[PDB]
Amino acid sequence: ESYHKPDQQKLQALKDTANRLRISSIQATTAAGSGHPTSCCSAAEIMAVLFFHTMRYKSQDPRNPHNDRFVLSKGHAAPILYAVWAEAGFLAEAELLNLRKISSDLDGHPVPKQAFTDVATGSLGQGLGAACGMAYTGKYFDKASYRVYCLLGDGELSEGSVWEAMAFASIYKLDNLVAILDINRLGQSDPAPLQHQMDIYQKRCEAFGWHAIIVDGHSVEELCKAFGQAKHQPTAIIAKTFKGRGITGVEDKESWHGKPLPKNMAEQIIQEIYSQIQSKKKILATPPQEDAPSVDIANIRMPSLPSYKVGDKIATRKAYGQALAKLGHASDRIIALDGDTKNSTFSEIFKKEHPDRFIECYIAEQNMVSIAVGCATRNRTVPFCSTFAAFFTRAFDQIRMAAISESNINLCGSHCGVSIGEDGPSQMALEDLAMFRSVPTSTVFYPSDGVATEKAVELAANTKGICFIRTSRPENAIIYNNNEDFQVGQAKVVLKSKDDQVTVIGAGVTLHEALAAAELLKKEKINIRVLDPFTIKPLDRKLILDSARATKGRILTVEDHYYEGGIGEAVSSAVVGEPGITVTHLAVNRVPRSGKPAELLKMFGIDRDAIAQAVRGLIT
């Protein structure tokens, strides 16, 4: 479609719109007694032009799959986002005044309970990565005409995650993506480092492969023109603005970030702004080309049962890659992402079979998670991210925000625990159960063999929320029949007898150590019950207690993880106060070191001999 070059009346209407957006942002934050009107006001012309000249969207259906996407990365400008959606006719204008109330959904930062919000962005520096996932999806998966626009602050640009996204967009030629940089000189507590050195921003953006245009961010004409040309590259509109623009005596001043105008001041400023508005008539939104495809919503099923053989040996990391590739044959919705670790996590198997649905994210875990979140928005794909579980700690804030975003993403972290051996603690995930259990929407799978791994992948694909699958580096025996039924929140008793003296709960490598301990103890005429949780969250409390009541109330948990936040603590919280129930823990008590896997399991007190000794001490 051609650019529609606006006339002076349209330009004036866009100015009027910007000023209405300023007034609303002030009114709402003054009413609330909190918020960030000066951060809204620097962005008012940008927002007016995007929503009422450049973008194409259905105003009454913000989630429509054909719409252009807008991501407010500087999420504390939420009041002006709400104001544009009232101006567009979706929100009632009276509701704006209920900003931040417990009776409203116009919360302090944007959240997906709002139809017009796809991702939550209040932790700065994350919106551009989500926008990259949306743009990648638009260009390569949906193959649709929608564009993606992301508004960032200048202080925000200090976050490394932004630059990971910058680099991703140029690697992947996201010529459907526009970043708008609100260069208002100031952050929260001081000027942003570069202030109004517009040329350095341009140099940085260009060095990272973007087409960079410096504009007057308070000129509706310059904005219309800059937004109105498509490029063959991701485009950065570097907008020189003033914080608090239009608020006389606050514009360009320190000490005003996140400070509402008092009521007396708001009334005076609003009258000033209102005196600049030429007409009350509002501009209408323009709708999109409806070329996004249908996506199916059905259950994704593996094409056959697992085909492992009991007693064969495979690492659960390898079983993950096999299972993910298998699942990719059943549905085109499955996509895989990895951070330069595909030959360690075995996501390379998916890449080999389904290359068009694999996204190489390079050594940039933060951005990888954000790409996945963006790809999952509007249910366009079902993503599986992978790296070493230890390196998901690099992305915890992205994961945390993914739950606030109500996102359905799947994460598989390999190389858990000391059982990796020789690389040492930098590579050892010992806190990943703690981290993922603390994520409110999470489901935590810890498969102990290849069969359980395949079933975990299938279940994860069909489970909402943040799904985490913990995989292991070393090879262990297949213990489950291929036709064993697995469910979220259902554990398995893998060894039992009528005279079991302890219930030993292990997972992954420690399950296999517990089975070996049972063989040791047999020599001594001591039987133990062995339980494999399958999911750590939710935990099968019923089977755990039923087991413990069969074994004189005694539970021993053994885990390749630190003591805090892992399996032992989950079990203890589940059962504390149950009469007759005792819980004893074996876990890793300190930062490990290099050695062979078996040597480290021994050193850190979580191998067969440590388990056997703990069982004997219980009994006596």
Ligand X SMILES: Cc1ncc(C[n+]2c([C@](O)(CO)[C@@H](O)[C@H](O)COP(=O)(O)O)sc(CCOP(=O)(O)OP(=O)(O)O)c2C)c(N)n1
Task: Please report, in range form, the residues annotated as the binding site for substrate.
Answer: 36, 257, 317, 344, 415, 423, 473
Residue ranges in 348-367 that form contacts with ligand X under rule CB under 6 A: 363
Residue 562 binding: pick among a copy of itself, ligand X, Ca ion, none (C-beta 5-8 Å cut-off by kind): a copy of itself
328 binds ligand X (CB under 6 A): no
Give whichever of 568 and 592 is closer to ligand X, judged by the CB atom: 592
Residue 42 binding: pick among Ca ion, a copy of itself, ligand X, none (C-beta 5-8 Å cut-off by kind): ligand X
246 binds ligand X (CB under 6 A): no
Which residues are annotated binding-site positions for Mg(2+)? 154, 184, 186
Residue 330 binding: pick among ligand X, a copy of itself, Ca ion, none (C-beta 5-8 Å cut-off by kind): none
Q: Respond yes or no: is residue 365 known to be catalytic.
A: yes
- Candidate segments 130-138, 150-158, 359-367, 420-428, binder of Ca ion by CB under 5 A: 150-158
Q: How many Cα atoms sit within 13 Å of 478 on the Cβ side? A: 20
Q: What are the structure tokens assigned to 459, written together?
A: 């279940």
Q: What gap in Å lies between CA 154 and CA 144, rounded to an integer? A: 31
Give whichever of 22 and 342 is closer to a copy of itself, judged by the CB atom: 342
Cα torsion angle, 82, 85, 91, 94, sign: positive
Q: Is 450 exposed, middle or buried (0-12, 13-18, 19+ CB in 10 A)?
A: buried
Residue 614 Cα distances to 88, 498, 511, 528, 589, angstroms = 67, 20, 15, 12, 16
Q: What are the structure tokens assigned to 540, written together?
A: 């099968």
Identity at 136, one-letter amino acid code: Y
Pairing of strands 313-315, 475-477: antiparallel
Identity at 156, one-letter amino acid code: E
164: nearest Cα among 129, 135, 199: 129
Per DSSP, helices labelled H in 468-556 are 509-522, 541-550
- Candidate segments 146-154, 257-265, 444-452, 559-567, binder of Ca ion by CB under 5 A: 146-154
Identity at 89, one-letter amino acid code: G
Q: What gap in Å lies between CA 325 and CA 316, rounded to an integer? A: 14
Select the residue interacting with ligand X from 258, 287, 424, 538 (CB under 6 A): 258
399: nearest Cα among 334, 467, 298, 304: 467
Strands (E), 368-465: 382-388, 409-414, 442-445
Strands (E), 251-306: none
Shortest gap between Cβ of 188 and Ca ion (angstroms)?
8
Q: Among residues 221, 365, 431, 513, which one is catalytic?
A: 365
CB 83 within 8 Å of CB 258: no
Give whichever of 266 and 399 is closer to a copy of itself, judged by the CB atom: 399
Give whichever of 304 and 343 is closer to a copy of itself, judged by the CB atom: 343
3-class state of residue 341 by DSSP: coil
Which residues are annotated binding-site positions for thiamine diphosphate? 39, 76, 122-124, 155, 184, 243, 257, 391, 427
Give whichever of 339 and 597 is closer to ligand X, judged by the CB atom: 339
Shortest gap between Cβ of 554 and a copy of itself (angstroms)?
9
547 binds ligand X (CB under 6 A): no
Give whichever of 176 and 387 is closer to a copy of itself, judged by the CB atom: 387
CB atoms under 10 Å from CB of 101, counted, come to 13
Give whichever of 153 and 474 is closer to Ca ion, judged by the CB atom: 153
Select the residue interacting with Ca ion from 153, 217, 234, 447 (CB under 5 A): 153
Shortest gap between Cβ of 52 and ligand X (angstroms)?
21
241: nearest Cα among 201, 277, 285: 201
CB 427 within 8 Å of CB 404: no
Residue ranges in 62-101 that form contacts with ligand X under rule CB under 6 A: 74-76
423 binds ligand X (CB under 6 A): yes
Shortest gap between Cβ of 16 and a copy of itself (angstroms)?
30
Residue ranges in 169-198 that form contacts with Ca ion under rule CB under 5 A: 184, 186
Residue ranges in 104-133 that form contacts with ligand X under rule CB under 6 A: 122-125
| Count of residues interacting with ligand X (CB under 6 A) | 32
432 binds ligand X (CB under 6 A): no
Distance from the first to the final alpha carbon of the chain: 82
Site string for Ca ion, 536-575 (x = CB under 5 A): ----------------------------------------
Site string for Ca ion, 590-609 (x = CB under 5 A): --------------------
CB 390 within 8 Å of CB 426: yes
Select the residue interacting with ligand X from 182, 252, 458, 500 (CB under 6 A): 182
- Candidate segments 199-207, 340-348, 429-437, 496-504, binder of ligand X by CB under 6 A: 340-348
The residue of the chain with the least Cβ separation from ligand X equals 153
Identity at 266, one-letter amino acid code: A
Residue 39 binding: pick among a copy of itself, Ca ion, ligand X, none (C-beta 5-8 Å cut-off by kind): ligand X
Q: How many Cα atoms sit within 13 Å of 326 on the Cβ side? A: 20
Select the residue interacting with ligand X from 29, 427, 448, 503 (CB under 6 A): 427
Question: What is the DSSP code string of 529-540?
Answer: EEEE-SEEES--
Residues 6+ apart with CB under 8 A from 414: 317, 320, 341, 344, 345, 346, 386, 387, 388, 389, 471, 472, 473
Residue ranges in 28-47 that form contacts with ligand X under rule CB under 6 A: 39, 42
Q: Name the strand (E) or helix (H) holding 133.
A: helix 127-136
Distance of CA 536 to the CA centre of its chain: 20
Which residues are annotated binding-site positions? 36, 39, 76, 122-124, 154-155, 184, 186, 243, 257, 317, 344, 391, 415, 423, 427, 473
Give whichever of 76 and 529 is closer to ligand X, judged by the CB atom: 76
Distance of CA 457 to the CA centre of its chain: 18
251 binds ligand X (CB under 6 A): no
370 binds Ca ion (CB under 5 A): no
Residues annotated as catalytic are 365
By CB under 5 A, name the binding residues for Ca ion. Answer: 153-155, 184, 186
By CB under 6 A, name the binding residues for ligand X. Answer: 39, 42, 74-76, 122-125, 153-156, 182, 184, 186-188, 192, 243, 257-258, 339-341, 344, 363, 391, 394, 423, 427, 473
